[PDB]
RNA sequence: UGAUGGAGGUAGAGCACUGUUUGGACUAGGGGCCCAUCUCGGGUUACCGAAUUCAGAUAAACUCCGAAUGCCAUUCAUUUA
RNA sequence: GCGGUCGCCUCCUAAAAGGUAACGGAGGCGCCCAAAGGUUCCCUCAGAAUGGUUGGAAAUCAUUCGAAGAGUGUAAAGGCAGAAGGGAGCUUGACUGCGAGACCUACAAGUCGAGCAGGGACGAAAGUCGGGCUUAGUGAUCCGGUGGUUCCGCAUGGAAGG
RNA sequence: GUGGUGGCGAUAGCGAGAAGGAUACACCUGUUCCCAUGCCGAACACAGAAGUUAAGCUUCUUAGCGCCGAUUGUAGUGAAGGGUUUCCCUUUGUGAGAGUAGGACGUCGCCACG
RNA sequence: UUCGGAUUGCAGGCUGCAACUCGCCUGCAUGAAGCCGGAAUCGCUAGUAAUCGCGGAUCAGCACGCCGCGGUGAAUACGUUC
RNA sequence: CGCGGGGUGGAGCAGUCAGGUAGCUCGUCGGGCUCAUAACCCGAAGGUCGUAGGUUCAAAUCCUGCCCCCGCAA
């Protein structure tokens, strides 16, 4: 239920974050504001 | 049944009054700010007091029946 | 019935305010007082306890009926006379009040008079 | 307003003349009217509730606010954070309006209506009345009145007193 | 006596150097019992006293009973070898330091408050004496 | 007052035609009313029987 | 799906049976594991005597006592282990299961013996009249299996009785006076949202919905999901449980069987056998209506 | 070793919190008895008694307090190594 | 031998630094939270008395009393009402590379960390933010799997495979 | 003298009582605007200056509550010993808590105005 | 339901020394159960059943009963397996 | 004090694993059939599953305790 998450840039397709969330209380695939140091820019990181 | 306990954690002061210091030391581990940060301390995730600067340690009652941790450098 | 004094809830939030900012010979206080009428505005070193700049709406100089306008003068006049002192860096006290009136207009003016909050 | 300028001309002469206050800031002033409606069964089904808070609506013309439990009480079914019931808090002309509403058309509009308790004061100068029968002026709207569950209307005031407040309603309207 | 609820049913045996805080002197009675040694005093100890006392003043006067049993004590079943945890609570007792006031009377004429509490003493196993107020 | 949760809040006059009693207030212009402040009061089977047999 | 049916009923038959034999086994194995435990414990208490009767003690050799009543331990702990091992093999069972279950029906009737009536109906769109006209009627614990072809009318049927017919009509029909409908469309996509908002919508108990719906074979980590999320037989189960649930004295059944379980079909057919409410149905499984109905009624052009 | 400054809540003491606990004043409340019974309102065993209060106690897992020692440190002193 | 225990956290024991054993006393953990985080702004609790309708012993309303007698996701301890407690906005710093220096430490590990750089959040700004109130919520290597890689590629180019 | 703003362990506080508003602080009149109230211009914010300082706020009295706090004496206890050794005693040194005597209804500054 | 009329409140009428226990009738108001009745069971073959009212005996007053009276007026009986 | 197995209408039992809203048989009560009783037929009553709480939309069921019964020990 409780799950670890690897996140990923929408762009590189580069996971760069690892993370938890419920299903329950979070069941839409979950979306953040991260750094990428690949791109050393802040993009949008979704859940995969 | 009792027979258990947990590893003892080395708790209270590591630094004394009186005493240079290095930058980034650490002066008194605590769970709970049984003692407040001061001039040129500060303190971590743990409460854990820890000195920014050189100096020597000062202890200090912060008014009337809480402490205080203070560096003063030279 | 009671009701609170708003110069001790002031206060009470004043001193939520001074756990995190505090004056310095090289980054003294600006630090406000309002009334239902005029305003204050001292600028203080709390290392010494002692004050570097004065204005107010009570004295003499100002223009302007408006509280406001009131305000953004002192904030000309309590500007001229640190640039005078010979500072120009201050923190901002604002007293216990909100950034969004009177507070405001004094504190935008005197950023445009010169000093770097 | 006229109930307001009553307060102004004809009560604190009036009031003054009796208790002999040196100053006219001394005087009683009402300085709140609370309504307050607690439900219950809202647990059961909250629809009553929101039926609460349109009556509050119809006779006020200002929204409540939903109450709320902090605690939970087993006996009945009852958890914190659920809406028990809700409020209003009538300040100013609004407040003299809705007194000056009561006193004029309401309370003689119950069924036996020769008067209300005296002693219903807290020792300190407020009032506290309650409405235990709904339908008490016409734009009650008594086509969807459901149900009659009543009213806690509370009098806050700056008097000291119990004989203050008793006097100050008293001139003001309040048939005691 | 027992005491109907405690927090931790296990406790120290303790120690008892030194002289008693307070009960010290003699309160609310006219007569009280002294003790001049520390010792522990059991629950069937207190009320073989207490009555005692009772029946040689014929429900006269009255009696204060100062101590209380807060102490538990445990044992061992005989042929149970030492370790394998602690033992089972057997009773309840009361540690009474020297100085301590243990029975007060009052209501009652002198030499029948003496004779009471010399019975009292030969039930208990403290050494003790008399004590009066003033 | 804010916007949109209020309900319309208008000065109406309350009638009572008893005594022709005018007060003016806000509420929910002219109005029906029965009985009011200035209209009501406030502001047997011994007697049955004898009307019943004369006595 | 016949060789299906049959190996997997072997494969629950394999199943049942072997975890019947590791219950009574384990049980078996516990029940003697205890009483050698019992008997080690009688022998250990050979190392001690009696306080009571002199004597008694004075015990030699207490080391061998004690080495025999570990060797009675051992026996038990070995029968234990054993239990053990065939627990784990248990645990490994009863996963491929249904677990099936009955169903529950709101039924509800009154004295109206007659429920709905229909006379000399012929019914269309523009006057092409879609069927020839018919007259019929539904008394109380009566079913009726209403028939024909695909776009026959029977849909047609049901709006028009229920008024939301935007066609043209001729015709009588009649139902009762204050009649309560159930109703079970062929057209159900309109549901939308939680389940705690459509029991709210359409006025039920939560709980009850719930259960008809975990008796119709929908696990509870669903009800946590949206009706758009959700499968058209879930969203079907939905629909029926709103049936189910919706205390009601006529049932009005258009094509509840499309898309569910066979294991549905069979609920179905033994509840409405078991309880013979007053109903109209819809189908073409014209097995199920064999089963329950004898008036049966084929409408057509 | 001395001087100085610190951390620290132990023995002791105390009840200011948490628990245990004695006697007394008062008492919500709980018992019967009777009158009144729609079982409705009382009046008493100096009936059992929350809670408050007075006085007295108690504690390893209570502290308003709090040592002696011991500990850390002093480009402090003395003596040794 | 059975029972019980084996890893981790909290208290007492533990003898006012730290540490300290027992088959000594008591309890917990093998998670949760997308807000229960961050920031900005605002607020202060529990209970008692009084009065009031259903509504009682006790829901909710109002005044006073009210120094914490509450709450702090979850055990106990410590601590917190200058809030770490509570509420509402804006967000995602529950970032990347690091890290002087200290604590603990047999080793392996564990803990705290100012400060620098990049790129940001909040805020007017100061300035705070490298998860939560602090301390448990975890386990080596080998071996496999997934993604990326400017690395290698048995004479060369690839590929296999690392 | 009032107001603002800081430091010192409340010896500063809490309660009660008296007086005052010259300026001042305050209440106070409203919602016109910036802005705001899970409802309310009560609070926040804004504008004003009819009125009263009644309250708050200042100054004074009060030792009722709370705070501080000796000296003496004791318990405890380091070191050195003794005894009849789960404890008790002696020499020396230190030395509480409690209970008091007593203090204490503030001290130190900076700035603006009168 | 304008069904059904119970029950209940109020006013009256008669009888009779007296209508509370404990009468009959009327008016007003309320307007319950009950939508043809399980297992089972009863009467009846013709002017019968079914239904409709009328009178009388007792009776100061009071019967949905009893006795009698007449009005309207069916269906069925294959047949003795049971 | 501990270890196992039990507490479901009056009796005996499932349902407990796998939460889905209390049932099988007998018995009791009432009415029918019968000359009467039994059998038979038609009806009903009797339990929130020992109890106080949690988890859940929902608990006999899962969790935590508390109180009784049968074995051992004791
Ligand atoms: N609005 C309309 N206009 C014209 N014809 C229509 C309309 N709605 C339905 N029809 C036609 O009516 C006929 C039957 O329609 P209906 O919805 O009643 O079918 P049905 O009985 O449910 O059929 P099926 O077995 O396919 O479900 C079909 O020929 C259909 O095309
Ligand atoms: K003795
Ligand atoms: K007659
Ligand atoms: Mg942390
Ligand atoms: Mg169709
Ligand atoms: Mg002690
Ligand atoms: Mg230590
Ligand atoms: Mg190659
Ligand atoms: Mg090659
Ligand atoms: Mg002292
Ligand atoms: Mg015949
Ligand atoms: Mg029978």
Redesign the pocket.
């Known amino acids: 239920?409780?799950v670890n998450?690897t996140l990923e840039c929408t762009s590189c397709?580069?996971?760069?974050?690892?993370?938890?969330?419920?299903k329950?209380?979070?069941p839409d695939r979950?979306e953040?504001?991260?750094?990428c140091?690949?791109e050393?820019?802040?993009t949008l990181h979704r859940e995969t | 049944?009792?027979?258990?306990?947990?590893?003892?954690?080395?708790?209270?002061?590591?630094?004394?009054?009186?005493?240079?210091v290095?930058?980034?030391?650490?002066l008194?581990?605590?769970?709970?700010?049984?003692?407040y940060p001061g001039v040129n301390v500060?303190?971590?995730?743990?409460?854990?007091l820890?000195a920014?600067?050189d100096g020597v340690?000062?202890?200090?009652?912060k008014?009337?029946?809480?402490?205080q941790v203070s560096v003063y450098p030279? | 019935?009671?009701?609170?004094?708003?110069?001790?809830?002031?206060?009470?939030?004043?001193?939520?305010?001074?756990?995190?900012?505090s004056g310095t010979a090289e980054?003294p206080?600006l630090?406000i007082?309002?009334?239902?009428?005029?305003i204050?505005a001292?600028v203080?070193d709390?290392v010494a306890?002692?004050?570097l700049?004065?204005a107010?709406a009570?004295?003499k100089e100002i223009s302007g009926?408006?509280?406001?306008?009131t305000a953004a003068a002192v904030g000309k006049l309590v500007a001229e006379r640190a640039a005078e002192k010979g500072i120009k860096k201050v923190?901002?006290?604002?007293?216990?009040?909100?950034?969004?009136?009177?507070?405001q207009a004094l504190?935008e003016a005197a950023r445009e008079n010169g000093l770097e909050? | 307003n006229r109930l307001?300028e009553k307060y102004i001309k004809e009560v604190t002469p009036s009031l003054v003349e009796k208790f002999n206050?040196?100053?006219?800031?001394?005087t009683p002033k009402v300085?709140?009217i609370?309504?307050?409606?607690?439900?219950?069964?809202a647990?059961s089904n909250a629809k009553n509730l929101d039926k609460a808070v349109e009556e509050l609506a119809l006779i006020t013309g200002?929204?409540?606010?939903?109450?709320?439990?902090?605690?939970?009480?087993?006996?009945?079914r009852?958890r914190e954070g659920m809406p028990?019931?809700?409020?209003?808090?009538?300040?100013?002309?609004?407040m003299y309006e809705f007194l000056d509403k009561l006193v004029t058309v309401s309370l003689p509009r119950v069924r036996d209506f020769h008067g209300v308790?005296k002693?219903?004061?807290?020792?300190?100068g407020?009032?506290?009345?309650?409405?235990?029968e709904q339908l008490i002026f016409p734009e009650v709207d008594y086509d969807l009145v459901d149900k009659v569950?009543?009213?806690?209307?509370?009098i806050?005031t700056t008097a000291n007193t119990d004989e203050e407040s008793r006097e100050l309603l008293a001139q003001l309207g309040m048939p005691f | 006596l027992?005491?109907?609820?405690?927090?931790?049913?296990?406790?120290?045996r303790?120690?008892?150097?030194?002289?008693?805080?307070?009960?010290?002197?003699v309160?609310?009675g006219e007569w009280g019992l002294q003790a001049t040694e520390?010792?522990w005093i059991t629950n069937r100890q207190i009320e073989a006293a207490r009555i005692a006392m009772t029946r040689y003043m014929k429900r006269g006067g009255?009696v204060?009973?100062?101590?209380?049993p807060?102490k538990s004590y445990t044992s061992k079943?005989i042929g149970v070898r030492?370790?394998?945890?602690?033992g089972?609570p057997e009773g309840w007792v009361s540690?009474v330091?020297?100085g301590?006031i243990m029975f007060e009377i009052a209501g009652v004429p002198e030499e029948v408050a003496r004779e009471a509490l010399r019975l009292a003493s030969h039930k208990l196993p403290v050494k003790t004496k008399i004590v009066k107020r003033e | 007052?804010?916007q949109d949760?209020?309900p319309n809040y208008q000065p109406v006059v309350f009638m009572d035609s008893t005594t022709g009693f005018k007060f003016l207030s806000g509420s929910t212009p002219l109005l029906r009313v029965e009985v009011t402040s200035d209209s009501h009061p406030f502001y047997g089977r011994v007697d049955?029987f004898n009307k019943?047999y004369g006595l | 799906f016949s060789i299906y049916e049959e190996q997997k009923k072997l494969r629950d038959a394999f199943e049942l049976a072997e975890?019947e034999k590791i219950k009574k086994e384990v049980n078996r194995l516990?029940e003697t594991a205890?009483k050698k435990?019992?008997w080690?414990?009688?022998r250990?208490?050979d190392k001690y005597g009696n306080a009571k009767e002199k004597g008694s003690g004075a015990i030699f050799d207490t080391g061998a006592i004690?080495a025999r009543?570990?060797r009675v331990?051992?026996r038990?702990?070995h029968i234990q282990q054993r239990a053990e091992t065939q627990l784990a093999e248990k645990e490994k069972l009863?996963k491929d299961?249904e677990?099936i279950?009955s169903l529950?029906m709101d039924y509800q009737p009154?004295?109206h013996?007659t429920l709905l009536t229909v006379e000399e109906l012929r019914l269309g769109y523009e006057k092409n009249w879609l069927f020839a006209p018919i007259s019929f009627s539904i008394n109380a614990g009566e079913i009726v299996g209403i028939t024909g072809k695909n776009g026959s009318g029977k849909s047609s049927l049901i709006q028009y009785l229920l008024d939301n017919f935007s066609g043209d009509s001729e015709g009588e029909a009649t139902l009762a006076h204050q009649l309560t409908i159930s109703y079970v469309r062929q057209d159900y996509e309109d549901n939308q949202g939680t389940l705690?908002e459509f029991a709210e919508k359409n006025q039920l108990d939560?709980?009850?919905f719930?259960?008809n719906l975990?008796?119709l074979g929908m696990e509870?980590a669903v009800?946590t999901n949206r009706i758009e999320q959700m499968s058209m037989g879930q969203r079907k189960k939905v629909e029926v449980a709103k049936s189910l649930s919706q205390s009601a004295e006529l049932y009005i059944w258009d094509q509840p069987l499309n898309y569910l379980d066979v294991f549905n079909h069979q609920q179905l057919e033994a509840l409405i056998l078991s309880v013979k409410p007053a109903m109209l149905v819809i189908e073409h499984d014209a097995h199920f209506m064999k089963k329950i109905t004898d008036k049966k009624i084929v409408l057509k052009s």
């Open positions: 239920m409780r998450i397709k580069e996971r760069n974050y690892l993370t938890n969330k419920n329950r209380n979070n979950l953040k504001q991260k750094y140091p690949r050393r820019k802040v | 049944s009792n027979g258990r306990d947990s590893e003892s954690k080395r708790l209270g002061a590591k630094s004394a009054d009186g005493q240079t290095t930058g980034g030391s650490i008194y581990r605590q769970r709970g700010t049984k003692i500060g303190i971590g995730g743990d409460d854990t820890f920014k600067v340690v000062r202890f200090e009652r008014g009337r029946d809480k402490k030279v | 019935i009671t009701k609170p004094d708003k110069n001790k809830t002031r206060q009470k939030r004043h001193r939520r305010v001074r756990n995190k900012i980054c206080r630090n007082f309002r009334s239902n009428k005029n204050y001292q203080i709390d306890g002692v004050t700049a004065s107010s009570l004295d009926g408006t509280k406001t306008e923190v901002f006290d604002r007293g216990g009040y909100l950034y969004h009136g009177r507070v504190a909050f | 307001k206050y040196s100053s006219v800031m001394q300085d709140k609370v309504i307050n409606m607690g439900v219950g069964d647990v200002q929204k409540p606010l939903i109450t709320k439990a902090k605690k939970s009480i087993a006996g009945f009852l028990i019931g809700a409020k209003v808090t009538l300040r100013g002309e609004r308790s002693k219903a004061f807290d020792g300190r407020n009032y506290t009345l309650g409405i235990k569950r009543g009213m806690d209307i509370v806050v | 027992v005491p109907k609820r405690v927090k931790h049913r296990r406790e120290f303790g120690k008892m150097r030194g002289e008693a805080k307070g009960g010290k002197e309160a609310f520390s010792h009255k204060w009973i100062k101590i209380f807060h079943a030492m370790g394998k945890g602690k089972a540690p330091k020297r301590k | 007052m804010k949760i209020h049955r019943k | 975890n516990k205890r435990a019992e080690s414990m009688n250990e208490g004690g009543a570990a331990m051992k038990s702990k009863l299961l677990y279950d529950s009154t004295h013996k705690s939560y709980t009850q719930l259960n975990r008796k509870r009800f």
